[PDB]
Write an enzyme that holds these catalytic residues in place. Sequence first.
Site, PDB file in Angstrom:
ATOM      1  N   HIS A  41       0.842  -1.233   0.000  1.00  0.00           N
ATOM      2  CA  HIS A  41       0.000   0.000   0.000  1.00  0.00           C
ATOM      3  C   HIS A  41       0.868   1.271   0.000  1.00  0.00           C
ATOM      4  O   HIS A  41       0.274   2.379  -0.088  1.00  0.00           O
ATOM      5  CB  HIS A  41      -1.063  -0.009   1.116  1.00  0.00           C
ATOM      6  CG  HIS A  41      -0.571   0.230   2.505  1.00  0.00           C
ATOM      7  ND1 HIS A  41      -0.938  -0.591   3.558  1.00  0.00           N
ATOM      8  CD2 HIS A  41       0.234   1.182   3.030  1.00  0.00           C
ATOM      9  CE1 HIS A  41      -0.380  -0.148   4.668  1.00  0.00           C
ATOM     10  NE2 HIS A  41       0.355   0.931   4.371  1.00  0.00           N
ATOM     11  N   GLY A 143       3.152   6.448   9.399  1.00  0.00           N
ATOM     12  CA  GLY A 143       4.608   6.296   9.205  1.00  0.00           C
ATOM     13  C   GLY A 143       5.118   5.009   9.826  1.00  0.00           C
ATOM     14  O   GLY A 143       6.262   4.615   9.515  1.00  0.00           O
ATOM     15  N   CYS A 145       3.762   1.899   9.581  1.00  0.00           N
ATOM     16  CA  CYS A 145       3.561   0.747   8.659  1.00  0.00           C
ATOM     17  C   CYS A 145       4.922   0.227   8.180  1.00  0.00           C
ATOM     18  O   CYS A 145       5.819   1.049   7.922  1.00  0.00           O
ATOM     19  CB  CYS A 145       2.697   1.122   7.462  1.00  0.00           C
ATOM     20  SG  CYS A 145       0.945   1.196   7.904  1.00  0.00           S
TER      21      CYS A 145
HETATM   22  C1  LIG Z   1       0.726   2.911   8.455  1.00  0.00           C
HETATM   23  C2  LIG Z   1       1.479   3.887   7.592  1.00  0.00           C
HETATM   24  O1  LIG Z   1       2.573   4.304   7.948  1.00  0.00           O
HETATM   25  N1  LIG Z   1       0.902   4.272   6.430  1.00  0.00           N
HETATM   26  C3  LIG Z   1      -0.452   3.908   6.000  1.00  0.00           C
HETATM   27  C4  LIG Z   1      -1.280   5.150   5.771  1.00  0.00           C
HETATM   28  C5  LIG Z   1      -0.597   6.106   4.785  1.00  0.00           C
HETATM   29  C6  LIG Z   1      -1.431   7.365   4.625  1.00  0.00           C
HETATM   30  O2  LIG Z   1      -1.360   8.288   5.443  1.00  0.00           O
HETATM   31  N2  LIG Z   1      -2.347   7.349   3.635  1.00  0.00           N
HETATM   32  C7  LIG Z   1      -3.756   7.060   3.918  1.00  0.00           C
HETATM   33  C8  LIG Z   1      -2.010   7.503   2.197  1.00  0.00           C
HETATM   34  C9  LIG Z   1      -2.039   6.177   1.464  1.00  0.00           C
HETATM   35  C10 LIG Z   1      -0.717   8.263   1.980  1.00  0.00           C
HETATM   36  C11 LIG Z   1       0.821   6.416   5.268  1.00  0.00           C
HETATM   37  C12 LIG Z   1       1.597   5.138   5.471  1.00  0.00           C
END
Ligand SMILES: *CC(=O)N1CCC(C(=O)N(C)C(C)C)CC1
Lengths: 304, 304
Positions: A41, A143, A145
């Site tokens: 993702h 951040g 993830c």
């Molecule tokens: C968990 C993590 O660090 N992560 C998932 C969400 C993502 C974000 O803020 N969004 C919803 C977009 C896909 C940029 C950042 C990274």
Amino acid sequence: SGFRKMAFPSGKVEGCMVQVTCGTTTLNGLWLDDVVYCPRHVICTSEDMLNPNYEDLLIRKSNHNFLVQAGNVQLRVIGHSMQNCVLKLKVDTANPKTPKYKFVRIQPGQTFSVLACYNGSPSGVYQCAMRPNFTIKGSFLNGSCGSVGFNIDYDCVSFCYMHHMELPTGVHAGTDLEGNFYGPFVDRQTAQAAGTDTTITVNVLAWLYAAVINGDRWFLNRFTTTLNDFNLVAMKYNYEPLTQDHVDILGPLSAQTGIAVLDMCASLKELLQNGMNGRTILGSALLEDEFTPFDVVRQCSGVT
Amino acid sequence: SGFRKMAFPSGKVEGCMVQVTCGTTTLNGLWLDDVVYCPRHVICTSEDMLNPNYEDLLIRKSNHNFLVQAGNVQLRVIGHSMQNCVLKLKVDTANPKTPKYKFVRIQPGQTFSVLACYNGSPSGVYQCAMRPNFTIKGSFLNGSCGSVGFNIDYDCVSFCYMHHMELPTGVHAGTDLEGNFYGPFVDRQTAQAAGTDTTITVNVLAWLYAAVINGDRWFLNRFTTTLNDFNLVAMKYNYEPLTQDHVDILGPLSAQTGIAVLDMCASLKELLQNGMNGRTILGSALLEDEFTPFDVVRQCSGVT
Ligand SMILES: *CC(=O)N1CCC(C(=O)N(C)C(C)C)CC1
Ligand SMILES: *CC(=O)N1CCC(C(=O)N(C)C(C)C)CC1
């Protein structure tokens, strides 16, 4: 004496954490040998997260779009593939700090340490279990993830979790390092609800053994029970049904303390039916189920 | 979201842990630059521990009696002195993995991570506070002495604790890295009893802010209080008296949540007078006092 919620030392995993940036999205990757693992993702816009087709989104991505930074040094991406829900980015340099390691898919009730990272920089370490509903109860901001969960077997790091998803109820979902999610969860911003969070009975019993072993004994009683009688009470209280296998696993702790597993079950039964009455066991006011038998033996013996 | 009892990443401190053997006694040392720090009681026989004269016991000790082993490599001891209750063994080799570091004497209520070690090998990491009675509630078996407690300020490790003593009540006593014990404790096998274990009020309030911030809000009420009214209830419940300084320290968390510190005090008051009624806050059935305001801000912002 003393019994604490203990994570493995993080050192060996800190040396495996890199920052992965794709477009405007920055999260964490695991650098083992010449491969960086990260959640697929990373390629999504918040927009994409609603109904992403990852194969299609990926086509618009080249090696040079994945910016990989170990501390202050950039890694050259020479390849990228999608395995299930993870990306594996091949870098031209093998991580010099790669420990001995395995990828293991853990069962629910099994515990592991999480090294929470932001921009590939470790912030903290804490102990978790894979819940019977295949959630974990973490601490993950944006951040975080690509933060991984692990066990250490002396020198060999068994990586069991990569963080992907926060469910709207503030519990956490992720994958083994082959990219397969624990439970029915998906890398999609959709209606996903955790099932019943059942208590890990075998883990509570381990922790009751841990308490006796450390001098907290007030909850020892005169009663015994059977698996079948005990499980009636488990059921009512959303506890995992206890098996002969759980009993076998608690044997060593039985042996050491000279308390039959079923007597300890009868103690747990009374605690469920009567609660704590405002008392504490190992400084806790509820029944802790995030210590395995193995965790108790380890911390009560002093393995490194 | 999620809030967990989080230790700093252990890596930087793992690389500082050595085994110190004197005679038949093996425990842990801290190798920073060309000095290994360890508890002076390494020189004692169980017999000596009853009424040891450390200056006298030390005279029967030479540099070559202190066996210092970093993993599988021995360090040459070229000097040894006693500072208060620690030994500083000068080695001929500076630790190549020495991080930036300070020695800091922490106040009670202040939190730190402990890297539990056995034979200079790290086994686990967990978060602690210096209790207002100057004990800590650790997990320490035999061999665990010389295990250190620390904070990390990004790259600079502030070492605040070395483990020396288990009191017969299974709580833990130790020194700052200058060898001075926290509280009235001594490296002697004598009648030493912990004073009242008071709750760190400011830390409970921080953790109440942490809970609101993570969606656990059921304990928010319609009432406010004063420091003087609140402290009457603190007193009765063996809580630290709350100062304007504690209120000032909670300001940032006040700001973020838009909940006045005194309203949150009134929430704590009700919780003290009425208990939890079988409910939980951040997965805990009692009021957690081993998160500082600083710990909450850190974990709720995502500092590395
Ligand atoms: C968990 C993590 O660090 N992560 C998932 C969400 C993502 C974000 O803020 N969004 C919803 C977009 C896909 C940029 C950042 C990274
Ligand atoms: C804490 C620790 O590792 N430690 C202190 C006790 C000591 C021991 O077993 N005794 C009583 C003798 C002094 C050998 C071992 C080292």
